[PDB]
Amino acid sequence: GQNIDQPTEMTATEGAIVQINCTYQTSGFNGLFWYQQHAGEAPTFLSYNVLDGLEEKGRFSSFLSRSKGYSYLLLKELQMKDSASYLCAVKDSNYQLIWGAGTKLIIKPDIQNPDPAVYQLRDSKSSDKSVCLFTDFDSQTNVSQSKDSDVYITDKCVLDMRSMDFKSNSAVAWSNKSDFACANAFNNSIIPEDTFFPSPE
Amino acid sequence: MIQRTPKIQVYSRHPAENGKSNFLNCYVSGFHPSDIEVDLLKNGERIEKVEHSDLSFSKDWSFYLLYYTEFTPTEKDEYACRVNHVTLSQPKIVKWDR
Amino acid sequence: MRTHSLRYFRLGVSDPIHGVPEFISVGYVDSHPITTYDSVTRQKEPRAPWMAENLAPDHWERYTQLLRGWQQMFKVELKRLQRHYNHSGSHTYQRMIGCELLEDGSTTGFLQYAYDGQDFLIFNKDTLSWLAVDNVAHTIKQAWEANQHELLYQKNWLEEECIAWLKRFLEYGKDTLQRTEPPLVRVNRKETALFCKAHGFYPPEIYMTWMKNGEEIVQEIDYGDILPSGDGTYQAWASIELDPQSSNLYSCHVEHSGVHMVLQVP
Amino acid sequence: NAGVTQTPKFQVLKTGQSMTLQCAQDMNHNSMYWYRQDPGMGLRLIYYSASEGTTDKGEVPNGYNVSRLNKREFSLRLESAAPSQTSVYFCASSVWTGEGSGELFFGEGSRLTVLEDLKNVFPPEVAVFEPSEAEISHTQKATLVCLATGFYPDHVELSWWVNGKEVHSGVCTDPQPLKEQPALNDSRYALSSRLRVSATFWQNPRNHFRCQVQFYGLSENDEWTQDRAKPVTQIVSAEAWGRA
Ligand code: NA
Ligand code: NA
């Protein structure tokens, strides 16, 4: 049959270069498309190739080799706004579009001054939950999901304070258990040795 | 605009022999535009059961057609093809010659 | 193999006579029609039996949809040309695309348009540009050449896709397209000239000429058209005027599908 | 100007319910399409319309119907909704079809969830948690956290409001919800968001913070028989004031 193959997910560092591959086996060829789709949004057209070679469009370049049946989308000087899924699609001999599953591009921010810490947020009088914030850690740190059923841990989020040109990673953990404490909330993750744990009470 | 008059050629499928069943062809070609009217004639009378191919296209943008019917040639019967086109002030009749 | 070609035609008429379609599209392999579509049927149908037997209904349903779209675009384009020419009445718009697979393995590819049966725009797939015949075509040339990606698409379709379709259709109807029926050649006199006629031959490509004492005389020869006989074979002829004041050795020469033939007139 | 406009943004359906998705384009395009997007696979064409006056089935026509009402509009019809039709639907258009280089213009998308029983639908519980004092003294920054928990399906829009105005700078919301019970198939969801401001901005006692979650749920015609409150479309929010 006809299949389009691209990697499920790619992770690169801010400011670096990433190459997203797309190989296709189709009955006939009338061009290859690349689309960008931010999470929760509509795909938007990026590029079109039908003859062999490389075409540039700002920071993005698209290459095509008809004989090898593959293409790549080249992203230079990666920025955080490049975080999205990238969809490749090929028109076959009957002008039908065959879509690849898409590649999710994750961008690690460059944290100039890491200050990893786990903070206890103040309780809410309308909630029985205790909330902990693991924040300001380097982008190489991964946040593992909870191994306790009544403890909930979200994946890391990259926050951008525009006025100060400041970026920081953070993840949240919460629970209503009596023995839940921020000192052990992220115990299932590999956290930096210098992580700051302020005193309770 | 340039309007091109049709070229009319009347001929038999096989080398004709009196008494042998044959096909009388009228090949109309080189005309433009596409609207055209063709009739095969037997002794000056229109032949009812006459078939024709679909309108065909040439590389020089003109059109062509083939009208034909099954017949048996005799020394007495005279055959012709009558064609009408916007480039013709009156119908043109081309007789079968052999 | 011999030289083979695949071609698609489109015809658009702006103010057609009642019952006459405003849009027609027909495909050919060599001299054989293979597909047909018009604005009346609004369906793509086979015109050769070996096409219907090798293409699934999914193929005809898909291109029927594309042709309905191509019909609408053709009407919009003809509407635009006739407005730019400031022409009233009924006018014709034509398109021809196709390719050739030559005997030596080389390929050719072509795409061009016509207005009122005359050349309008001709595509050059090597320079990737359109040749305009007048200023109405020049305006269209500017708009089409601004879309560089579509020019590249046309080059790929002509050089790659068209050739692949041709080889595909060539295999489907090889019993028809790749056969050889030699011509039957005869010479007779008519008042006074020598007519040398061939008939019953396929493919239609044939070369007939007269020679006088072993020397060609093309200006003297009258060449007849290669005409369909109606049974899948073709016929042709060539005449030459007879000189009544001197004896000469006339001979009809016929070449067809790699075989040469000589008929000396006694 | 508007491009491709499709509605509705979200929709919950019971098995067997009817549904019509609207799509209009104002770009004078001729070709329109209806896609569905599912995890782990590329876009699949449901139906398409090469030009006004003709439509044809795509790769997955079964369960759907379309109407090319005019040159601008191309509606998708689900006559008897099925759980397999839970997906994100995208309508698109192009200038023409049968050409190589013409690209597609996509609408914003429609997220449909089809359920056997509406008793699985829950609105979110929303709470705001004020910044850590240790964070303020260590970093001179203050991070508030908003938790939206226990909602189903994942049809929520979270936003922060500072002094009556919606803000986006300094805001990070989880791009994907968290399954509260990851083993269950119909698990309720949790969503977290952070708003980080300077310490001086948080320490202004007049500054007001609010996180709002728009939940898309049931409507008037949806039948409800549970003891708890009917989980209709609603806004759930919580607030906090600056602390000096
Ligand atoms: Na006339
Ligand atoms: Na259906």
PDB file of C-alpha atoms and ligand atoms in Angstrom, chain B residues 84-91, ligand 1:
ATOM      1  CA  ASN B  84     -22.061  21.698 -43.535  1.00  0.00           C
ATOM      2  CA  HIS B  85     -19.922  24.056 -41.444  1.00  0.00           C
ATOM      3  CA  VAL B  86     -19.924  27.711 -40.423  1.00  0.00           C
ATOM      4  CA  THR B  87     -17.171  28.239 -43.011  1.00  0.00           C
ATOM      5  CA  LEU B  88     -19.481  27.023 -45.818  1.00  0.00           C
ATOM      6  CA  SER B  89     -22.103  29.305 -47.326  1.00  0.00           C
ATOM      7  CA  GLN B  90     -23.963  26.201 -48.547  1.00  0.00           C
ATOM      8  CA  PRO B  91     -23.463  22.455 -48.019  1.00  0.00           C
TER       9      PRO B  91
HETATM   10 NA    NA E   1     -22.928  26.668 -42.999  1.00  0.00          NA
END
